[PDB]
Structure 1
Amino acid sequence: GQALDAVRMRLAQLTHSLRRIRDEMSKAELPQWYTLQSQLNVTLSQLVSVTSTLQHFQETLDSTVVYPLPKFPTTSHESLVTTLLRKKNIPEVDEWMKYVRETSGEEIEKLLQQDREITNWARTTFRNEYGKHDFK
């Protein structure tokens, strides 16, 4: 419950930041560019923290089993239950990665290791380039 509690508080503050950026964008007059950058960076790094913390506690979330309350009436709130129950993605993202995979399209494994060696080589090359010139 502790992990889900931390997820709750962090997601609540993320939703609060979203409500903020919403009600300062809803104005008919656009504020200064710098305030928009500050709000963007803060909210976006907060989203990063959301992702990282959700990553950290996957085991606690998975272990939990969902069950409706005995006191909760489904006869009158079945629509509300179904609203939270449904999880299928929005369609546009679906065909989005479908076209993405269409465009992308032992052989695969050796290309994978070739990518490994290119990555390592590029990292070493840029380390050497940084070391070549004194930046301090």
Structure 2
Amino acid sequence: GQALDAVRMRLAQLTHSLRRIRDEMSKAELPQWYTLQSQLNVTLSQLVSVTSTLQHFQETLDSTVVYPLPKFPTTSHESLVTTLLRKKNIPEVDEWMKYVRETSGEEIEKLLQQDREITNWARTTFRNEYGKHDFK
């Protein structure tokens, strides 16, 4: 419950930041560019923290089993239950990665290791380039 509690508080503050950026964008007059950058960076790094913390506690979330309350009436709130129950993605993202995979399209493994060696080589090359010139 502790992990889900931390997820709750962090997601609540993320939703609060979203409500903020919403009600300062809803104005008919656009504020200064710099305030928009500050709000963007803060909210976006907060989203990063959301992702990282959700990553950290996957085991606690998975272990939990969902069950409706005995006191909760489904006869009158079945629509509300179904609203939270449904999880299928929005369609546009679906065909989005479908076209993405269409465009992308032992052989695969050796290309994978070739990518490994290119990555390592590029990292070493840029380390050497940084070391070549004194930046301090």
Percent identity, aligned pairs only? Answer: 100
How many residue pairs match? The answer is 136
**Length-normalised TM-score, structure 2:** 1.00
Deviations 1:83-125 (A, max 9, x none): 0000000000000000000000000000000000000000000
1: CA distance, partners of 2:111 / 2:41 = 36
2: CA distance, partners of 1:120 / 1:130 = 15
**TM-fit CA distance, 1:68:** 0.0
**Length-normalised TM-score, structure 1:** 1.00
**TM-fit CA distance, 1:61:** 0.0
After the TM superposition, list the runs of 4 or more consecutive aligned residues in structure 1 that deviate by more than 4 angstroms.
Answer: none
**TM-fit CA distance, 1:32:** 0.0
Gapped regions of structure 2 (runs ≥ 5): none
1: CA distance, partners of 2:78 / 2:123 = 55
Gapped regions of structure 1 (runs ≥ 5): none
CA RMSD of aligned residues (A): 0.0
**TM-fit CA distance, 1:43:** 0.0
2: CA distance, partners of 1:132 / 1:120 = 18
**TM-fit CA distance, 1:18:** 0.0
